[PDB]
Symmetry: C5
Subunit: 311 residues, 5 copies
């Protein structure tokens, strides 16, 4: 067993195809996802060709070890895929049709900039390293690229599974490498974030603003501080579900901005009390009266600015 030789001096074309059976475990923190799919391989090996009329058989079967099979590997995997050879069929002209069922944990980075309203493009990079006797080149058989209807990825919507038809051929350690890009397009199901994180977070912030309709320093301190602690809880909960990004995310920005509002509300609450003690409740009253309008307006304005910058 060694590579099929060239008729002229052409490279060996191995036609590929990935058909997704299962999608699961998209881990945001790890930036990984699990896949269960069919891997299809097709190439011509003339040494295997036969007569259809004389052989009586139109197709011949082979056990993996019996024939030369190209070493196709995945670039972005944690460990080498778990493969089960489903079938090897050889047609009269020496065209081989290989099929395996595999499962792998794919490493594909995610862009957290618009979280939880983000969309992603997951990648599966197929690769083949050229042998000394000949160069191996990959290609996409669009007929054998797909996914089953039931393929569901929890908390995400599956847009498309396509392959970039033109392989990226390059030199690596003094030998040719032919690389293919299979792309899984998904978009996050943001629904649940609204009643679980967004609205609770806004409610606790609005509750803090009731201190603008109270002259009790002791009650205000409780209002602002308490809600600030609940905000820290939400911040912590949110940051545990996400990886540490070198860029600012949409959620990150909002969560951060909100801290400034709690800080300024504390200052206001302190100022109001200070003036009151200092026997000037009229300045204190106008500062509070302003804040009543200022706080929601600046909050609403700031959010528009951020949504603009982010979307």
């Amino acid at each position: 067993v060694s590579p099929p030789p060239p008729i002229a001096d052409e490279p060996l074309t191995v036609n590929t195809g990935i058909y997704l059976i299962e999608c699961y475990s998209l881990d945001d923190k790890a930036e990984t996802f699990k896949v269960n799919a069919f891997l299809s391989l097709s190439w011509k090996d003339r040494r295997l060709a036969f007569d259809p009329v004389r052989s009586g058989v139109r197709v011949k079967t082979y056990e993996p070890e019996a024939i030369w099979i190209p070493e196709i590997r995945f670039v972005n995997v944690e460990n080498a895929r778990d493969a089960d050879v489903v079938d090897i069929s050889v047609s009269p002209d020496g065209t081989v049709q290989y099929l395996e069922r595999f499962s792998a944990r794919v490493l594909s980075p995610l862009d957290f900039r618009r979280y939880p309203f983000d969309s992603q493009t997951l990648h599966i990079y197929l690769i083949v390293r050229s042998v000394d006797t000949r160069n191996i080149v990959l290609a996409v058989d669009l007929e054998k690229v797909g996914k089953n209807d039931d393929v569901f990825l929890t908390g995400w919507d599956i847009e498309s599974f396509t392959a970039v038809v033109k392989p990226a051929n390059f030199a690596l350690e003094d030998r040719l490498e032919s690389k293919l890009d299979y792309q899984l397009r998904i978009s996050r199901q943001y629904f649940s974030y609204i009643p679980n994180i967004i609205l609770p977070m806004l409610f606790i912030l609005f509750i803090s603003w009731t201190a603008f309709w109270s002259t009790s320093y002791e009650a205000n301190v409780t209002l602002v501080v308490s809600t600030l602690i609940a905000h820290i809880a939400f911040n912590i909960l949110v940051e545990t579900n996400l990886p540490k990004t070198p860029y600012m995310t949409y959620t990150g920005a909002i969560i951060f901005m909100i801290y400034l509002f709690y800080f300024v509300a504390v200052i206001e609450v302190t100022v109001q009390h200070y003036l009151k003690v200092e026997s000037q409740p009229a300045r204190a009253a106008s500062i509070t009266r302003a804040s009543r309008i200022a706080f929601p307006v600046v909050f609403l304005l700031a959010n528009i600015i951020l949504a603009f910058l982010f979307f």
Copy 2:
């Protein structure tokens, strides 16, 4: 070793049967469950048929590698099942009786809409890809589908383990695929949710309503804010045990609605104090007096509406 050829031009019928030995690890967040069961396979291979007379044995035992065995796979599995061939028996007419003991992590989505009062239908999809020489079709031998009496799935009740007798035959990459649906019907044991999450959650909310029988703003702010923090704790605890659904769940709805009650109670508490400071305790008194009846009534009404919409 290659498929048994057709007498006429009929497809090969493989008679299946799953007998559950163990059920465990139903992970709600992951929407997976672990299973340990017997897989039974039966098909006719005439090339193996014999005369009971001349041979002097009414059965024939084989090692897996010695005979042709159909490639039965599970659709909804994380990784290929762990199988141990228990026995392979051949009857005089060439009827093969295959038995294996397997364990697998099955991916089956759950409908969280009625959580924790929900019921589920877990699936085990058996599949067979047809060969070039012939088409393979699956069938259910009802005699070999079951579960042992001891099969317990922690915090769930096992209703039934049945199989949809008629397979779903379809084309996949120009070959025939025959798919069978084994269904495990279960219903959640909601008991524990009552004293652990439900009642504590209601108690903390009722405690918040004592602020309707108090004129102390400072005590009221403490009552409502404190309990709101305890509610956030319960919300967080609940949401960590569940996956992110694109739909509203029953518990989700309740938890969410309750936030509105805390928000409105804060408003009431603020209003009462504001009026009192503004030297009009009679308006404040009537608002408070109404709230004492309004809050429980609207809570009880809202819950009826929700239970109705959900069940």
Copy 3:
């Protein structure tokens, strides 16, 4: 390699023995435990008979694949046991003495009703399915059932490791199955629960009762609410360490009952303040005075009732 044949028409007796080397990872939530032990098997295969004269050796040593070995499996395991064949010895008569060292994660349900003062009976079910040529029956060789003295299972006391001598023989999918029950009796080391969960929990509850010697509504609200939050913390901590049971557990009952005490204390605290504001401190004083006695008495009575019902 196929079963040894009967002299008369007797079933094959495979003697068994489990000798525990290691016990670890008793997971309460999962209701699983890990075991590392010796599995001993002994059956007569006359086909292996030999003359020590003609063969030199008094006992013959065989490699697993060389001889017929009965397929012994465990019923209540997650996955097939990790086995290492330690020795296979055949005496001249053909008596086979098989020894393997295995490790497995055993699934055995637990009765949480008396937690953390509960005792358990863990099971290891050995099984053998009968072949077509002959019936296989299991037996216990009491001489080969044990555990080493060092066998420690963290936070549990090991009472006994015994086997139910009489196997449970039954039909399963048209063949005989011989099942054996090995029983590991253990009892929980409740010590640590006293200073870690019990006493802290009682202290925080007693602290709440100081509100019965205070006329300050604002301090009382803080006392009762604060401690209630600390109780929720303990409840959550406790419930994370346990699986969701369809029955009430001893700890569960106590934790639940305590909520009622916090609820009633809030009511009392509210009533006392209401009456005081309403210019009737004498009724308030007598209600408080009774509560000081009522609360500890009813708590102590309720606990006796519960301990009675549970033990």
Copy 4:
């Protein structure tokens, strides 16, 4: 392949040696540690002996399967070690020199009594079961017992890696077993516990004692209750990092004792207020004044007593 026969009737001496390459993952809760080391084995097999002069080769190398190798196993392991045979060398006299590189998860109990100022002795028990033809006995070749200089075990100091030279020979299931004890002496790096758990815990307790210089019941209730909640947090954090011991640990004792101080401080705070309301501030003043001295003195005394009892 079968055991080398005795010259006289002596047992087979297997010389052992463990050389630690990597030490990691000391899990306190699980009472396990991971090891990566060389396992050296040496015995005499006269059947393999040769002429030094006539052969012209000083030593001869073999493949595992070619020769008889004793079955050395570890007693206290989770699962059977991952071994790679590095080399097998036979000298002229028939002395076999075996070397393998292994990795295993060792189960070794820990004494938490002096945590986090404790020291431990981790064990690796080598074992060999005697064959029918002859008895196998283990020995330590001190020349081949060691560890590399870089061997670091995070948050622990490695004192020594030694072996108890005299094996423990005993009967187990009617055959001789020769057991060796390799001991890894380590001591915990307590440094970090000081600024992370100890000092914060003491600071929150001291903060609680400021209530002895305050006449405000409402502020005191806040001071004592708040800090008590922070103490519960530390207790919980500490207990999550440790297994449930049937004995009292040093930290456990301290954490527990501190609860009593919070309880008594609440009593004091209640008493002071009660007396003040009851128009007797002079008794209240002297009780508070005493507490100011009593609390730190009894704390300091109690700690000395405990440190004494524990070290």
Copy 5:
């Protein structure tokens, strides 16, 4: 298969090269990282040499088992690497060119002193043990040491992947061991720590200092205690993400220092109230007025001192 013999009496040089394909899972607590890379090996084996003319081939391909391949192992790995032989090529002079693709979990300690502004040098130690017939020495072929452009390690910046050309040759258990050091230089992406941990932590501290512009003991106690609890939360969050170091880290120092500020602020708050009750508000006023300047100044000074000592 045995080592290629020396022409003179030279040691065998094995040229090495590591080309990183993937980098992931840098676990700070565990001090481990996962790698996926190509391992290249090249040595001269004269026994494999051939005349290009009588062969009609420029190269010769071999299956691992067919030829002698040196046993290269990694020193700092958890378990033996997962390797797939990609290719084995032999040039006419008997120069062997070996290529494998591997994945391993590398144990490499980290210096937490400047966290989260730290940089690290991860190591991959290649090792070879010398055989009896001859000594094996490792060498770096700089042409075959690299990483692909896509190599990303989440939350870290990859500076360089280089190899220390000169191997460290030494004796280990009477055999010569040749060790090579491959170094991955990385630096932490500190960005996210600023809005997630740093700024929130500073804000809660500044909020505590508003008590210097308040005469209300009850509000102050709330301000300082509340924020202290939020600080404990951040401390706990930070310490869970890091391993226990025997040295003080930069973050560790800051977190610790901040506790002292909370403690002193409580003292101030206590003193101010004490004096006020004791009818001397002028001393109290000047102490408070000083603190307003003292606290930020000493905080700013302390930080400069620390940043100096650490960077």
